[PDB]
Each structure stands twice: as structure tokens, then as C-alpha cells.
Design a protein around this ligand. Sequence first.
Ligand SMILES: OC[C@H]1O[C@H](OC[C@H]2O[C@H](O)[C@@H](O)[C@@H](O[C@H]3O[C@H](CO)[C@@H](O)[C@H](O)[C@@H]3O)[C@@H]2O)[C@@H](O)[C@@H](O)[C@@H]1O
Ligand SMILES: [Ca+2]
Ligand SMILES: [Ca+2]
Ligand SMILES: [Mn+2]
Ligand SMILES: [Mn+2]
Lengths: 241, 241
Amino acid sequence: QDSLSFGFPTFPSDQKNLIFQGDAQIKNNAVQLTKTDSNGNPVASTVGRILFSAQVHLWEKSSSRVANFQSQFSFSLKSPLSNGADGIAFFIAPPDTTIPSGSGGGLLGLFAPGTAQNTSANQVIAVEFDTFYAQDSNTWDPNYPHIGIDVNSIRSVKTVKWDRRDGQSLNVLVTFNPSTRNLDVVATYSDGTRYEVSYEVDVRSVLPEWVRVGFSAASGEQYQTHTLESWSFTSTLLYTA
Amino acid sequence: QDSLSFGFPTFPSDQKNLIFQGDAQIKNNAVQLTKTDSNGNPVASTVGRILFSAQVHLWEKSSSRVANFQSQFSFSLKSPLSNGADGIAFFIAPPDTTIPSGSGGGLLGLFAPGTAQNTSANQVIAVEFDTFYAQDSNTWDPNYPHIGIDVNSIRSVKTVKWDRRDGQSLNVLVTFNPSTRNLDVVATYSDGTRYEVSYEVDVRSVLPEWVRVGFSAASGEQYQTHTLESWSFTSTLLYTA
Ligand SMILES: OC[C@H]1O[C@H](OC[C@H]2O[C@H](O)[C@@H](O)[C@@H](O[C@H]3O[C@H](CO)[C@@H](O)[C@H](O)[C@@H]3O)[C@@H]2O)[C@@H](O)[C@@H](O)[C@@H]1O
Ligand SMILES: [Ca+2]
Ligand SMILES: [Ca+2]
Ligand SMILES: [Mn+2]
Ligand SMILES: [Mn+2]
């Protein structure tokens, strides 16, 4: 299809079009990307991701068209610790993507340790909400919590300082305009606190024509819940001239 | 997802979200439901269907909601014969639906001979454009080409006279309003000739909560091509009160 849209105001337990990977699962009308105990508390060493089953036609070589897309979602992070880790990310990747071996902790379940910073060995665009930046284990991170745009590397091409608020939902809008090639990210808390980060990228040189979209999250030694509360997505192929 | 939408203005050969069954395949940017030889001419004894891969949430028992949906599509039929057969149908059925054994010809690839008219043995709602009505083989049909609404039986709950026009595209809009429980069908030819038929049906008592949607066509002894040219579909769960 030239156009595709879907919306999950909430996540009922009965799902048919979601691909669950790792520890991801539905809990109380929300997607818990990372594992939690029976009490609902976060645990260490866990990775989980979800992808929508239908493939998205990002670009078409034969017609010279590139899709514009918009992804709106909200999530909350909760943790008994003040330094919860590791973060959640919205990502776009080839349809057969699976959790890379050893991609836990700071790699957010998106990159393999050996090639995490090799831009020619990966095919992924992600928007990360990174809460852990210890320079001993996350050597690629700026020294503060941040939102980042990742293009084939865990080392963000662009970041903006961000504030982690335990238990508060963050509303996010990610948009891509093929006319300008700008990938824009706008995140806001209910009180109006806003964060913005943008980057120009030619999706045609990074990802294949058909892709799958979803979310990934992980916790290494430090932990926190990564709760996806709602998600809507829309994409439409347009003539880029 | 509570809401799902997709649009195929045309059907390029590179498809990823369509389930092809029987002889259905893409040719010349359109879906040829029934088999055609090397010259593109229709052949006898063929059946084919396509379904969109993502499942549609038709209704939700826990929230008492039912989907409002709209399916817009266009197709054309062509045959050297004076009596092209057998017809094409838009249908909604359980996710695991497959072509029934012996469902060829007048059964349109939707029903099995033994239970074709047994309503308690089927789970399918379809809108058929039936061009073959020989009273000796298709005993259930009115004696003329027609548009019919089928609910768990090949014997339409309702039919309206229709004119088959060789090589001309018919644009169809099928809508379901959960408030009134009305399934409306409006079809038009490019010269403004219009056909309308409506039926009140509670989809909750006919189909499961999750279903797949698609098209089916067949040709028995007599034949014609059944070409699906475009298709857009949208569904959204709504409160019924
Ligand atoms: O695809 C059409 C039809 O094919 C299969 O039925 C086989 C034949 O069954 C009967 O003999 C007739 O209906 C015949 O139709 C011809 O004869 C009719 C009466 O002489 C005439 O009205 C028709 O126009 C035609 O010339 C069928 O060919 C079987 O697969 C059916 O399900 C299917 O609908
Ligand atoms: Ca980090
Ligand atoms: Ca018939
Ligand atoms: Mn980071
Ligand atoms: Mn009929």
C-alpha cells in the first residue's frame, strides 16, 4: 500500500498484529518492554522490543517517491533507583530485524557490541530516550540524560539534553518530511516542558524500501520499567521533487 | 489497533502485505484474481483470493465497541464469451480463512458445496458481483446478473439487478455503520449509472472479534478476468449506545 495508518489508544491484552521480541509483553493495557517481577517492579538484565506486523513502504525506487511519516506515542519510566537505565527507543529497520546478540544495557537492544559504532554495518534509524550515561560503560554518550537521533550507530548524530521524570508520561511526536528530509522530534511533559531535536537524513541511503517500525528498551545493571502507553502511526508515499 | 487504514491506488508487483491464495497474482499493476494465459486471456477452472495481512479488529466484547469501516475499490471484468463467469466478491472472514475444497465456479471461492447454503456452518460476510446465473447450476441465484449481500450463505440475503459491462471499471463503496447496523453498498460506472443496496446486520453475531478482509473470484466452465484495480480500507472501533 502507498499509505498505511494504525492507532493504539491503549494496548489490550488481546493483540494480533504485534511482533513481541525478548521480554516484551502486555500488562494492564500497556506494553512493558522490559521485564518486571510479580509486584510490577523492574528487574535487571532485560531486553524487549515490539514491531507492527505489516511492513511499511518507506520509499519506492521505480516511482522516485519517499514516504512522509508521523509516529505519536507516550511512555513512562518508573524505578526505585534515581539512576534508572537504560532507555527506550522508537526505531525503523529491515523487516527481519531481531534482537542482536549481546545488545543489552546501553545498546538498548538495537546494536551488537562489536559493530555498535560502525555505521556501514548497520541499517537502523532510531530516536532514543537515554537515561544512563556513565562514561565507563556508555563511552559514546554525552554526560547527561538525553534524547538522541541514531543513524546506524549507538553514537547519536544529534542529541538534546533531557530530563528524566519518574512516573510521568512523556508525549512524543516524530515526523519525517521527504521534501526537506528533516526528521523532527518533539517531546513534552503534561506541564508543557518541551524538548526538540532535528536532523536531515536521506532515508533512501540508510534503509531498504520496505521496513518495520517499533520500539526497543533494555536495562543492564541499573533498571527501570519502560512502559509504552499509546502509539499511532501514519505513512504516505509522496513525489519528492 | 483500534484503528487501521491502508490504500492501494494501484498494485505494483512488489507486494509485502498481501496474502495470495489460489491463482491470484499481480500483473500490469493490478491484481488478477483468476488465472490468465500468456496472452492475458481468461481461462476456465480457476479460483483466487487476496487478503490484507494485518488483522482487523471488527468488534471488542470487553468494551462493547463495534467498528465503523469503509472499503472503496474498483474492478473490471473482460471476456470474449457472451456469458462470462463467475464473479468477484469483497469479503470479511476469520483470519485463518482458506479456499474451501470444491469452492470453484458459482461458489466464488467462498463456500464448500456441502454447506454453501447452511448459515450455521459458515462465518463470512461478502458483497458479490455475480455475472453467471444459469438456473440449472446456480439454482440459488435470481435470473439475471446482480449485486448481492451474502451472510453465511451463497444464497444472498438480498440482491439487486446489475448490468455487466465488459472492460469497464466499476467503482464500489461498502460501508458499515455500527450505530444503525447498516451495511451499505453503492456502485457506479463512469457514466454515472448507479446501483445501491443495503442490509441491516449485527456483525457481532456473524464474525469473530478479529478478521481479515480481501477479495475472491472464480471461473468454472465459463470464464472472464476479474481484475482488482484499486482498494482503500479504513476501520475504527466505536462505542455503540
Ligand atoms: O462457470 C459457470 C459454471 O460452470 C460450471 O457449471 C457447468 C455447467 O452447468 C450447467 O450445465 C449449466 O449451468 C452450464 O451453463 C451453460 O448452459 C446453460 C443452460 O444451457 C446456459 O444458461 C449458460 O449460459 C451456459 O451456456 C454450465 O457451464 C460450475 O462450475 C458452476 O458452478 C459455474 O457457475
Ligand atoms: Ca546510554
Ligand atoms: Ca452465480
Ligand atoms: Mn545515548
Ligand atoms: Mn449470486
